[PDB]
Design an enzyme around this catalytic site. Sequence first.
Site, PDB file in Angstrom:
ATOM      1  N   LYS A 158       0.868  -1.171   0.000  1.00  0.00           N
ATOM      2  CA  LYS A 158       0.000   0.000   0.000  1.00  0.00           C
ATOM      3  C   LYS A 158       0.910   1.227   0.000  1.00  0.00           C
ATOM      4  O   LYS A 158       2.072   1.161   0.434  1.00  0.00           O
ATOM      5  CB  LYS A 158      -0.953   0.006   1.193  1.00  0.00           C
ATOM      6  N   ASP A 174       7.655  -2.162   6.415  1.00  0.00           N
ATOM      7  CA  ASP A 174       6.600  -2.895   7.095  1.00  0.00           C
ATOM      8  C   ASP A 174       6.477  -4.332   6.627  1.00  0.00           C
ATOM      9  O   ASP A 174       5.621  -4.681   5.807  1.00  0.00           O
ATOM     10  CB  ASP A 174       5.249  -2.191   7.110  1.00  0.00           C
ATOM     11  N   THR A 191      -4.505  -5.097   4.426  1.00  0.00           N
ATOM     12  CA  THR A 191      -5.248  -3.872   4.555  1.00  0.00           C
ATOM     13  C   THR A 191      -6.467  -3.986   3.643  1.00  0.00           C
ATOM     14  O   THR A 191      -6.339  -4.488   2.518  1.00  0.00           O
ATOM     15  CB  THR A 191      -4.340  -2.680   4.165  1.00  0.00           C
TER      16      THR A 191
END
Lengths: 340, 18
Positions: A158, A174, A191
Amino acid sequence: EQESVKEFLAKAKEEFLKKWESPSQNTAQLDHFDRIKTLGTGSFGRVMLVKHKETGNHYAMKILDKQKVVKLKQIEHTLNEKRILQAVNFPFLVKLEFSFKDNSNLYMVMEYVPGGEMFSHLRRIGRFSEPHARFYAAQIVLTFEYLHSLDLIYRDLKPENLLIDQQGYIQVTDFGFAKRVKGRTWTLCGTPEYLAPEIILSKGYNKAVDWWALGVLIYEMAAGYPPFFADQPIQIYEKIVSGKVRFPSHFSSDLKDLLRNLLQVDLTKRFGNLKNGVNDIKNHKWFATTDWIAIYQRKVEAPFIPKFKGPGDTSNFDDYEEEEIRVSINEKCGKEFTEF
Amino acid sequence: TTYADFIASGRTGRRNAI
Ligand SMILES: CNS(=O)(=O)c1cccc2cnccc12
Ligand SMILES: CNS(=O)(=O)c1cccc2cnccc12
């Protein structure tokens, strides 16, 4: 005559496996650093700008509360994150410089990337042009080719997790959901906007979920909004599984074609997951102008250089509420995190 | 417009993992 990608990746796997099998541990301590400011927060921790006292170098230190990690059932994921990040090496992956733990927290000290999150730049500008989006996408393609060759799935692509360095290239951060797996896995993680249908539907899944997420990212970069959005995650999931997708009128024919093939609900038809693997993506018409060698070598002029005000300026990041780092007098969750 | 619908939505800020 070219350097072989196959041979490059074989050597890179030898290098990775040595570090995977013998991870680094306890390579700094908290009092080596001055804590400056929070750069970001996530569901599991906070990242702080810190300055090394002896050298003056700035770093980005992720801090995880061991008790929060246990409560949220992220023990194994956190061990994955650190074991993987300390073993990987690629031009578009943030470097883990040091790691350590104390009575209360786990710490991962990474290179500081002052240019800010792609998220911030994307939202401000609205959308990226197709050549701009393609420059970033190419780096993700190469990064996933590398990670997947090591049997790693990334699982949290993302714009929030992509930093822009001072050359204008991407640094992926991440690894909280990254996992080394041969075959399939089942964890519901990611997500919402970026979840592949097979995750939502509680199927076993594999590295093809990362190629789906690439389609979401490319769409979002080029449109300025994601392909499946709503006010609540549950309505997003319904759209994902449908999985009807509509494109802005300004998307090129080749971009639409690539995205239909990445955003394919049918795993047996999804690009990245066919007989020719990543080469179906690299050889797609939308990438015809991409010099894959030059991208890897960072020889392409980037579309955008972040404003430089460093070495430790944070003006490309949002402000966050600051909370004191507390270290208990008693060791917490020692057994759970022995290998960290 | 789809853009306007996105911008008026509640998910234009940073999205947390599940
Ligand atoms: C994604 N943004 S952040 O969570 O603030 C972050 C995380 C990990 C490494 C970083 C390196 N430089 C800047 C920010 C960094
Ligand atoms: C082997 N030649 S290279 O430039 O060093 C390179 C390294 C890693 C991945 C690559 C993927 N595509 C092209 C070249 C790539």
